[PDB]
Amino acid sequence: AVQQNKPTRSKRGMRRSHDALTAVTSLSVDKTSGEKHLRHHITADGYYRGRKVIAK
Amino acid sequence: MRHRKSGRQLNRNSSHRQAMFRNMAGSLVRHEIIKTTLPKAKELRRVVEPLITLAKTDSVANRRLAFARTRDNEIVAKLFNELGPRFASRAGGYTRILKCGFRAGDNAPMAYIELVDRSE
Amino acid sequence: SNIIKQLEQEQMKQDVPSFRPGDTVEVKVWVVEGSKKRLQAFEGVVIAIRNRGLHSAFTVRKISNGEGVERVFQTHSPVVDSISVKRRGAVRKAKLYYLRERTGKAARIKERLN
Amino acid sequence: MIGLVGKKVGMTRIFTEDGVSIPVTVIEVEANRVTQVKDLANDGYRAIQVTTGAKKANRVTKPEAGHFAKAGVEAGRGLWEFRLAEGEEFTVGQSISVELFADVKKVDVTGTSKGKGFAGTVKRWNFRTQDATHGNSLSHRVPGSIGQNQTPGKVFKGKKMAGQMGNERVTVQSLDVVRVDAERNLLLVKGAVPGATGSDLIVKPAVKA
Amino acid sequence: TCARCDSXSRCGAXGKXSGXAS
Amino acid sequence: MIQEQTMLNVADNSGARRVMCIKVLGGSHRRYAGVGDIIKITIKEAIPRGKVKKGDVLKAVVVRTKKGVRRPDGSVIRFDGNACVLLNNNSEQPIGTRIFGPVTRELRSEKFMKIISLAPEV
RNA sequence: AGGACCGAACCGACUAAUGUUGAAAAAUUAGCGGAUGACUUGUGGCUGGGGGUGAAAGGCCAAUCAAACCGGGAGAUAGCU
RNA sequence: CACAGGUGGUCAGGUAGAGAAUACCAAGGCGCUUGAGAGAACUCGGGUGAAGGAACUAGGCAAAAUGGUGCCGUAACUUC
RNA sequence: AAUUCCUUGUCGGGUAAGUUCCGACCUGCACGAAUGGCGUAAUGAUGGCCAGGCUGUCUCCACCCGAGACUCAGUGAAAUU
RNA sequence: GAUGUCGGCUCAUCACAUCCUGGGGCUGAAGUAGGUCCCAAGGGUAUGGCUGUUCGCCAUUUAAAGUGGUACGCGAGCUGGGUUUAGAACGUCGUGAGACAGUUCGGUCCCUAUCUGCCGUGGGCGCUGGAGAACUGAGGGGGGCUGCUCCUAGUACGAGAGGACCGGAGUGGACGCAUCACUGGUGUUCGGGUUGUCAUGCCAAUGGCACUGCCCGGUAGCUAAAUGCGGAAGAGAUAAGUGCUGAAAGCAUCUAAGCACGAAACUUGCCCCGAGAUGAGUUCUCCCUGACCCUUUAAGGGUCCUGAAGGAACGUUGAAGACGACGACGUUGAUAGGCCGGGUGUGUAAGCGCAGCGAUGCGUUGAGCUAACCGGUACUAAUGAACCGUGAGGCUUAACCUU
């Protein structure tokens, strides 16, 4: 269970071809305060779907 | 496989799940809003909400059955004295899940679980 | 489900009497001897009742000619003609499986005397 | 012949008059209505394309909405296609009922079997478990050898190994049809058919005669 | 280092143990 | 559900008390013997003035299993012991002239008429 | 009373399984032998390499032993690679 | 190695127990320096199992099983 | 036979069936009397065989409970080449 | 400057010099049962006692218990009994150290898979405008075993004894697919009993720990030992074989012309995958119809307005699942949790009262609790929007609208 020949940097870049990160790009805008947040999450000031939630 | 089976194992045995659900149910009855991970916030519904359903109707046997669970006199006092007659008309859905991003140490998806009204 | 339960509740016997584990019960069963159709009786202690609507069954244990015969009877089947309760026993379980190990004077059960 | 697209409702039991148990499976076959007929002129072969049930308006797409609305027919949960036998000739918009099976005496049921997940060789191929003791090191439920030595020197195609089991199309053949009742839209076939409760089934007349 | 590990070589791998310290 | 090394009881007055099933007949790789089934037995215990002696390789027919039988409506009959009636190697209609205990309806097959006739129940 | 019996500490190591780039260059877990004796242990001391010591296996003498380790003869020699 | 190892002495609570065994606890001390999920094959450590019961295997290896106090009773052989 | 090559010698017992085991025969290749012969109660983590009990050891596997394996976040090797 | 050894287990795979099943010639082939030879590799081809054994002998089966190749297949799959390390002993050889292709007891089996292969499952682009579906089937894989009984019929055959071809049906064994209705197993997420101890101030009732403490039952799910189903029939081309007509060779001759039968082998028929079948196919449906610059003037790039069908993303999830994937659903909502009723399981809760000196019994009471099940219910969570995807689709030739 060890290699007999060193793989190339071509094969190394081909293995990492699927290691790429999907960027989010789907940030929602709160309607009350106009803050950017994740979709289905609370804001940094703490609103969710218009009405006031937790704190801080 | 897992066909039609309910209940998160939560990387624990049954004893630790029962004690941790007991402590987290006591913390949610006490503070009325707590912050935990999202699968634990979803398994906490199935633990906390039958206690409020049990505490709709006050009796000695319902109090000793709510003390067989949750093991605290102050928690069962708040169940049968406050949370019972506030949720007496609401038929289920005694609590609310609100996702709040992630956690700094392990990227755990966090969630606030709270009661519906909270009187705050 | 409504299909299944509505299709099952038109084959169920409406007159099967109530009985509990520990009740000495005589079940009468149609048997086919060649081209003759005859009742034979099977009397024994009910040691298990499984209730599922149409899929209900019950286990009857007796001692024949040396050793213990247990027949599980499908309740709503047309092979059983009658279920008659003679003695009413007093136990504290739903399954009297320990009677498989007990025989004789140690396998006596009480009578539900009220 | 043509088939009918049903839903598996579950299994139950019919008692006969002479005290015999028949294990039946219940298939709810609603109105199977033709959405398209195919012939050698426009398509190259003879077939019909049926649908069944009903579907939400907001989730059926506009190509599907146009395909159903050309026939003037209400949308259904899916689209299936059956191959004609040149004695039967059908038009677009005819509802095919369960009363077709009143004289068929035996059916073939095609379903999608239950998904077992990534199964192992013991479950998937009925391999023998090795020794639980008498020395065995970490190799109780493993496949064992998968080939010879230097001749061929490879694993052959179609080797029995671990992998996906179930969630696949399977047909059970020559099932004695017990009862066909159109008042309840039901087909009761003797035995067990592939799939979980609530899954699509295709019921055809049998072919082994 | 010094753990041995073969039946009998000067240094191979082997899960046994009388031949083998590199 | 009888296989090899199974110690059965003996349900006739042939002499033997405990037999051992050494082969289940009627097929290649055949694992289990039900109630209409022929087995090959050896004798492990007998009575001193019986018809058969210890260590005879002969046949038997299993007449009571502990796994049970199945009837067409789905009704099992579990006995509390395994018992065979000892047959002969060539000439059937068995060695014994009594049968202890009941039998089942699966021996009504034109070849065990004497067992179902001599049986006290069923 | 007893190189007595059973059994913890304590001294060992019979079997299995794990581990085998180990948690560990010899262990862990579960069972196991002795356990008032020819027992075991702390602390100090003596025996030194063809020598020691050995209820003896060529066993042990600082993870090394059919002749320890370190320095020197020494860049031994090598018809071999 | 912030290493499942090794390392002499002294102190020696409660309840149950013959006991410094063991089980639950007190005083006291800890939760063992990566977590969060999911609940595939397979590996490890365990629990249960129809009918049969050593048919397994080099071999009953491993598991299962027995298990305590009081009393009744106990063979061949023997250096008594 | 811890010894016997031919050899699984022959007879008997145990088994449905016994190259092992127990008894005996003597044709001891190649036992033999303190490099001891033959017995021998007790003892043995000693060797061979048989029986009762008991069992997933097996027919033939099934399910469940935990720790890994899988995914995400942090850190981050190794043999080989 | 290492290609690990016999035997067993697991998993195989090929050859035919075929063991059974299938076909046929000859028979010193009456029948049954054989003997021999030709064809045929589709499927199948035993469990134990002994021994480390391969083998062999034995016992009981079986339709039959095939013979070989595959590093005497198979240790980066397992074992480690044999054997070829170190201990010890016997017999023998040797003065001895020791030795024996003689014997006996004991003796550590590593590897986290890079590439090929194989089993599975995905991402990307392609398929020429984009998209959502349903297919066609080039090709490939799975399967293919057989007993016994009954009828034909105690008929044909035969001194008797015995006893069929062909054909039909039923019931089995072994294997395989599916499934959970039944019967069971499991069910540390449900109920109850009980031991020790600690705690909730105490009694009472509980909870924690002791392998789930030990048990007893048991829902759903999974599952076999449970119960449904399958192996086909038919066709086409054939092998050995049987021929018809028929010359060469006035006859004869199965062959040279021609024509007809003929087997589990082959092509189909049954099942499953399958258009990356780059030879990238077909069919149905949907959507996109606005203008300006620059120059190496074309299958060019840039700019404004536009952002369709649809898709992903996010969330609630699933009898789907390692992850992706696939399926249901997102307020015009039953997708999940909760709730309501039921069902199931356990077995007559607690509290109070009566009786008993007391343990405890009895009544309220088939009570209370009840997971994953069933049928309902918007109470809670499934947010308006954003993101990708465009703006009519090349050239040449032929034919129709319109011979």
Side-chain angles (χ1 to χ4, degrees), chain F residues 46-75:
Chain F
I47 64 170
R49 277 87 62 189
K51 293 182 180 181
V52 295
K53 67 179 180 66
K54 183 181 178 182
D56 291 337
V57 180
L58 72 161
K59 290 185 181 180
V61 53
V62 179
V63 301
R64 288 188 293 273
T65 60
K66 193 169 175 64
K67 188 73 185 297
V69 303
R70 190 69 67 94
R71 296 294 178 88
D73 60 345
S75 64

mmCIF file of all heavy atoms in Angstrom, chain F residues 46-75:
data_model
loop_
_atom_site.group_PDB
_atom_site.id
_atom_site.type_symbol
_atom_site.label_atom_id
_atom_site.label_comp_id
_atom_site.label_asym_id
_atom_site.label_seq_id
_atom_site.Cartn_x
_atom_site.Cartn_y
_atom_site.Cartn_z
ATOM 1 N N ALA F 46 -31.968 -47.623 24.810
ATOM 2 C CA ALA F 46 -33.081 -48.539 24.593
ATOM 3 C C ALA F 46 -33.593 -49.100 25.915
ATOM 4 O O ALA F 46 -33.218 -48.612 26.986
ATOM 5 C CB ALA F 46 -32.664 -49.676 23.657
ATOM 6 N N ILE F 47 -34.458 -50.110 25.851
ATOM 7 C CA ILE F 47 -34.890 -50.856 27.032
ATOM 8 C C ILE F 47 -34.294 -52.255 26.902
ATOM 9 O O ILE F 47 -33.996 -52.681 25.775
ATOM 10 C CB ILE F 47 -36.424 -50.866 27.165
ATOM 11 C CG1 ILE F 47 -37.083 -51.589 25.994
ATOM 12 C CG2 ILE F 47 -36.952 -49.445 27.302
ATOM 13 C CD1 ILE F 47 -38.562 -51.849 26.195
ATOM 14 N N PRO F 48 -34.057 -52.988 28.002
ATOM 15 C CA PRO F 48 -33.287 -54.241 27.888
ATOM 16 C C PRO F 48 -34.010 -55.372 27.174
ATOM 17 O O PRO F 48 -33.343 -56.264 26.637
ATOM 18 C CB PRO F 48 -32.990 -54.605 29.349
ATOM 19 C CG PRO F 48 -33.072 -53.319 30.081
ATOM 20 C CD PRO F 48 -34.169 -52.560 29.410
ATOM 21 N N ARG F 49 -35.340 -55.372 27.146
ATOM 22 C CA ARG F 49 -36.062 -56.425 26.443
ATOM 23 C C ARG F 49 -36.931 -55.837 25.339
ATOM 24 O O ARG F 49 -38.100 -56.210 25.196
ATOM 25 C CB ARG F 49 -36.919 -57.253 27.405
ATOM 26 C CG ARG F 49 -36.182 -58.374 28.142
ATOM 27 C CD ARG F 49 -35.528 -57.895 29.429
ATOM 28 N NE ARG F 49 -36.523 -57.408 30.377
ATOM 29 C CZ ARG F 49 -36.236 -56.767 31.503
ATOM 30 N NH1 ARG F 49 -34.973 -56.545 31.843
ATOM 31 N NH2 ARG F 49 -37.214 -56.359 32.296
ATOM 32 N N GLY F 50 -36.372 -54.910 24.561
ATOM 33 C CA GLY F 50 -37.080 -54.324 23.445
ATOM 34 C C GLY F 50 -36.838 -55.071 22.145
ATOM 35 O O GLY F 50 -36.073 -56.030 22.068
ATOM 36 N N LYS F 51 -37.521 -54.603 21.100
ATOM 37 C CA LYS F 51 -37.369 -55.194 19.777
ATOM 38 C C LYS F 51 -36.071 -54.765 19.102
ATOM 39 O O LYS F 51 -35.490 -55.544 18.340
ATOM 40 C CB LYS F 51 -38.562 -54.823 18.897
ATOM 41 C CG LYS F 51 -39.876 -55.429 19.341
ATOM 42 C CD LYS F 51 -41.002 -55.059 18.388
ATOM 43 C CE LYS F 51 -42.331 -55.670 18.826
ATOM 44 N NZ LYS F 51 -43.446 -55.333 17.897
ATOM 45 N N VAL F 52 -35.611 -53.542 19.362
ATOM 46 C CA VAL F 52 -34.405 -53.000 18.750
ATOM 47 C C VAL F 52 -33.377 -52.720 19.839
ATOM 48 O O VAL F 52 -33.719 -52.488 21.002
ATOM 49 C CB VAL F 52 -34.701 -51.729 17.927
ATOM 50 C CG1 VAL F 52 -35.580 -52.066 16.743
ATOM 51 C CG2 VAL F 52 -35.380 -50.690 18.788
ATOM 52 N N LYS F 53 -32.108 -52.746 19.449
ATOM 53 C CA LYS F 53 -30.992 -52.653 20.377
ATOM 54 C C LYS F 53 -30.166 -51.405 20.098
ATOM 55 O O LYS F 53 -30.380 -50.691 19.117
ATOM 56 C CB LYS F 53 -30.106 -53.896 20.283
ATOM 57 C CG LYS F 53 -29.388 -53.997 18.961
ATOM 58 C CD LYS F 53 -28.498 -55.208 18.889
ATOM 59 C CE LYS F 53 -27.811 -55.265 17.540
ATOM 60 N NZ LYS F 53 -26.870 -54.120 17.375
ATOM 61 N N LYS F 54 -29.196 -51.161 20.975
ATOM 62 C CA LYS F 54 -28.390 -49.950 20.924
ATOM 63 C C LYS F 54 -27.385 -50.015 19.782
ATOM 64 O O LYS F 54 -26.627 -50.980 19.663
ATOM 65 C CB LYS F 54 -27.658 -49.755 22.249
ATOM 66 C CG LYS F 54 -26.839 -48.494 22.326
ATOM 67 C CD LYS F 54 -26.141 -48.398 23.661
ATOM 68 C CE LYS F 54 -25.281 -47.154 23.738
ATOM 69 N NZ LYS F 54 -24.560 -47.072 25.037
ATOM 70 N N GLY F 55 -27.383 -48.983 18.942
ATOM 71 C CA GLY F 55 -26.435 -48.895 17.851
ATOM 72 C C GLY F 55 -26.911 -49.529 16.562
ATOM 73 O O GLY F 55 -26.112 -50.117 15.827
ATOM 74 N N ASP F 56 -28.202 -49.419 16.270
ATOM 75 C CA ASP F 56 -28.768 -49.911 15.024
ATOM 76 C C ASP F 56 -29.078 -48.734 14.116
ATOM 77 O O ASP F 56 -29.720 -47.769 14.538
ATOM 78 C CB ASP F 56 -30.036 -50.730 15.264
ATOM 79 C CG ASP F 56 -29.754 -52.047 15.939
ATOM 80 O OD1 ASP F 56 -28.609 -52.531 15.842
ATOM 81 O OD2 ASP F 56 -30.688 -52.615 16.539
ATOM 82 N N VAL F 57 -28.619 -48.820 12.874
ATOM 83 C CA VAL F 57 -28.850 -47.782 11.880
ATOM 84 C C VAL F 57 -30.128 -48.145 11.134
ATOM 85 O O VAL F 57 -30.143 -49.084 10.334
ATOM 86 C CB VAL F 57 -27.658 -47.653 10.926
ATOM 87 C CG1 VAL F 57 -27.908 -46.576 9.903
ATOM 88 C CG2 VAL F 57 -26.405 -47.364 11.707
ATOM 89 N N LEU F 58 -31.204 -47.413 11.398
ATOM 90 C CA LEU F 58 -32.489 -47.715 10.774
ATOM 91 C C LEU F 58 -33.170 -46.394 10.438
ATOM 92 O O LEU F 58 -32.554 -45.335 10.511
ATOM 93 C CB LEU F 58 -33.327 -48.645 11.665
ATOM 94 C CG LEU F 58 -33.990 -48.224 12.972
ATOM 95 C CD1 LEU F 58 -35.066 -49.218 13.302
ATOM 96 C CD2 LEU F 58 -32.997 -48.200 14.095
ATOM 97 N N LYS F 59 -34.429 -46.436 10.027
ATOM 98 C CA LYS F 59 -35.118 -45.220 9.622
ATOM 99 C C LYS F 59 -36.132 -44.806 10.675
ATOM 100 O O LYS F 59 -36.486 -45.565 11.576
ATOM 101 C CB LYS F 59 -35.813 -45.388 8.264
ATOM 102 C CG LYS F 59 -34.865 -45.496 7.090
ATOM 103 C CD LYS F 59 -35.623 -45.536 5.780
ATOM 104 C CE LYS F 59 -34.676 -45.661 4.607
ATOM 105 N NZ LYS F 59 -35.403 -45.699 3.311
ATOM 106 N N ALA F 60 -36.607 -43.574 10.542
ATOM 107 C CA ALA F 60 -37.660 -43.055 11.399
ATOM 108 C C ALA F 60 -38.434 -41.999 10.628
ATOM 109 O O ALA F 60 -37.996 -41.521 9.580
ATOM 110 C CB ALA F 60 -37.092 -42.480 12.692
ATOM 111 N N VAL F 61 -39.605 -41.648 11.151
ATOM 112 C CA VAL F 61 -40.407 -40.548 10.628
ATOM 113 C C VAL F 61 -40.726 -39.603 11.782
ATOM 114 O O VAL F 61 -41.181 -40.036 12.845
ATOM 115 C CB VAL F 61 -41.669 -41.056 9.893
ATOM 116 C CG1 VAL F 61 -42.511 -42.004 10.743
ATOM 117 C CG2 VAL F 61 -42.519 -39.901 9.424
ATOM 118 N N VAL F 62 -40.426 -38.322 11.598
ATOM 119 C CA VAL F 62 -40.567 -37.341 12.668
ATOM 120 C C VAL F 62 -42.045 -37.007 12.818
ATOM 121 O O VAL F 62 -42.667 -36.517 11.879
ATOM 122 C CB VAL F 62 -39.752 -36.076 12.365
ATOM 123 C CG1 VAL F 62 -39.929 -35.062 13.469
ATOM 124 C CG2 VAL F 62 -38.295 -36.403 12.156
ATOM 125 N N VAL F 63 -42.613 -37.255 13.991
ATOM 126 C CA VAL F 63 -44.049 -37.096 14.170
ATOM 127 C C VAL F 63 -44.414 -35.926 15.075
ATOM 128 O O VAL F 63 -45.570 -35.482 15.041
ATOM 129 C CB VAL F 63 -44.687 -38.399 14.688
ATOM 130 C CG1 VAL F 63 -44.411 -39.512 13.711
ATOM 131 C CG2 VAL F 63 -44.164 -38.752 16.061
ATOM 132 N N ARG F 64 -43.479 -35.410 15.868
ATOM 133 C CA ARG F 64 -43.682 -34.202 16.662
ATOM 134 C C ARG F 64 -42.400 -33.391 16.601
ATOM 135 O O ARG F 64 -41.340 -33.888 16.979
ATOM 136 C CB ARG F 64 -44.026 -34.526 18.121
ATOM 137 C CG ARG F 64 -45.410 -35.090 18.357
ATOM 138 C CD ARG F 64 -45.732 -35.190 19.838
ATOM 139 N NE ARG F 64 -44.914 -36.179 20.534
ATOM 140 C CZ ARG F 64 -45.224 -37.470 20.622
ATOM 141 N NH1 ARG F 64 -46.326 -37.925 20.051
ATOM 142 N NH2 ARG F 64 -44.432 -38.307 21.275
ATOM 143 N N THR F 65 -42.489 -32.163 16.114
ATOM 144 C CA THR F 65 -41.381 -31.227 16.204
ATOM 145 C C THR F 65 -41.656 -30.216 17.303
ATOM 146 O O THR F 65 -42.782 -30.051 17.765
ATOM 147 C CB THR F 65 -41.146 -30.501 14.877
ATOM 148 O OG1 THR F 65 -42.320 -29.767 14.516
ATOM 149 C CG2 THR F 65 -40.812 -31.473 13.777
ATOM 150 N N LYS F 66 -40.603 -29.523 17.710
ATOM 151 C CA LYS F 66 -40.730 -28.416 18.642
ATOM 152 C C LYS F 66 -40.831 -27.074 17.928
ATOM 153 O O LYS F 66 -41.406 -26.132 18.480
ATOM 154 C CB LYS F 66 -39.538 -28.437 19.601
ATOM 155 C CG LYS F 66 -39.646 -27.559 20.806
ATOM 156 C CD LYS F 66 -38.536 -27.895 21.775
ATOM 157 C CE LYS F 66 -38.532 -26.946 22.946
ATOM 158 N NZ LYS F 66 -39.770 -27.074 23.755
ATOM 159 N N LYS F 67 -40.299 -26.980 16.705
ATOM 160 C CA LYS F 67 -40.516 -25.803 15.873
ATOM 161 C C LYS F 67 -41.967 -25.713 15.418
ATOM 162 O O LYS F 67 -42.522 -24.613 15.326
ATOM 163 C CB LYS F 67 -39.571 -25.843 14.668
ATOM 164 C CG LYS F 67 -39.560 -24.581 13.821
ATOM 165 C CD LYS F 67 -38.850 -23.441 14.526
ATOM 166 C CE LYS F 67 -38.956 -22.152 13.740
ATOM 167 N NZ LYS F 67 -38.294 -22.240 12.422
ATOM 168 N N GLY F 68 -42.591 -26.842 15.122
ATOM 169 C CA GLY F 68 -44.015 -26.905 14.884
ATOM 170 C C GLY F 68 -44.359 -27.270 13.452
ATOM 171 O O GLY F 68 -43.519 -27.706 12.661
ATOM 172 N N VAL F 69 -45.638 -27.097 13.132
ATOM 173 C CA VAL F 69 -46.162 -27.241 11.786
ATOM 174 C C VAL F 69 -46.792 -25.913 11.394
ATOM 175 O O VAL F 69 -46.847 -24.981 12.190
ATOM 176 C CB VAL F 69 -47.196 -28.381 11.670
ATOM 177 C CG1 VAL F 69 -46.611 -29.688 12.125
ATOM 178 C CG2 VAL F 69 -48.442 -28.055 12.467
ATOM 179 N N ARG F 70 -47.263 -25.827 10.157
ATOM 180 C CA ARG F 70 -48.062 -24.691 9.730
ATOM 181 C C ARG F 70 -49.304 -25.207 9.025
ATOM 182 O O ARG F 70 -49.230 -26.145 8.227
ATOM 183 C CB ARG F 70 -47.283 -23.758 8.797
ATOM 184 C CG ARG F 70 -48.006 -22.447 8.517
ATOM 185 C CD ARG F 70 -48.028 -21.615 9.781
ATOM 186 N NE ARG F 70 -46.677 -21.207 10.121
ATOM 187 C CZ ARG F 70 -46.139 -20.055 9.753
ATOM 188 N NH1 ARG F 70 -46.858 -19.174 9.076
ATOM 189 N NH2 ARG F 70 -44.892 -19.777 10.089
ATOM 190 N N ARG F 71 -50.430 -24.600 9.324
ATOM 191 C CA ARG F 71 -51.699 -24.907 8.691
ATOM 192 C C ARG F 71 -52.024 -23.851 7.643
ATOM 193 O O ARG F 71 -51.415 -22.777 7.641
ATOM 194 C CB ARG F 71 -52.794 -24.990 9.761
ATOM 195 C CG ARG F 71 -52.563 -26.126 10.726
ATOM 196 C CD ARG F 71 -52.691 -27.450 9.998
ATOM 197 N NE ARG F 71 -52.435 -28.582 10.876
ATOM 198 C CZ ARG F 71 -53.366 -29.176 11.611
ATOM 199 N NH1 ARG F 71 -54.616 -28.741 11.575
ATOM 200 N NH2 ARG F 71 -53.043 -30.202 12.388
ATOM 201 N N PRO F 72 -52.935 -24.135 6.696
ATOM 202 C CA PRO F 72 -53.228 -23.149 5.636
ATOM 203 C C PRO F 72 -53.788 -21.808 6.095
ATOM 204 O O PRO F 72 -53.750 -20.860 5.306
ATOM 205 C CB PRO F 72 -54.235 -23.889 4.748
ATOM 206 C CG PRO F 72 -53.881 -25.287 4.901
ATOM 207 C CD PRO F 72 -53.461 -25.464 6.323
ATOM 208 N N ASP F 73 -54.304 -21.679 7.317
ATOM 209 C CA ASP F 73 -54.747 -20.366 7.766
ATOM 210 C C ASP F 73 -53.669 -19.582 8.505
ATOM 211 O O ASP F 73 -53.863 -18.390 8.766
ATOM 212 C CB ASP F 73 -55.987 -20.470 8.659
ATOM 213 C CG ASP F 73 -55.752 -21.296 9.903
ATOM 214 O OD1 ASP F 73 -54.745 -22.030 9.980
ATOM 215 O OD2 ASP F 73 -56.555 -21.165 10.844
ATOM 216 N N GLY F 74 -52.554 -20.213 8.856
ATOM 217 C CA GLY F 74 -51.477 -19.509 9.519
ATOM 218 C C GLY F 74 -51.397 -19.825 10.994
ATOM 219 O O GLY F 74 -51.075 -18.955 11.806
ATOM 220 N N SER F 75 -51.671 -21.073 11.350
ATOM 221 C CA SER F 75 -51.802 -21.489 12.740
ATOM 222 C C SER F 75 -50.799 -22.595 13.030
ATOM 223 O O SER F 75 -50.901 -23.691 12.469
ATOM 224 C CB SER F 75 -53.234 -21.948 13.019
ATOM 225 O OG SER F 75 -53.571 -23.093 12.272
#
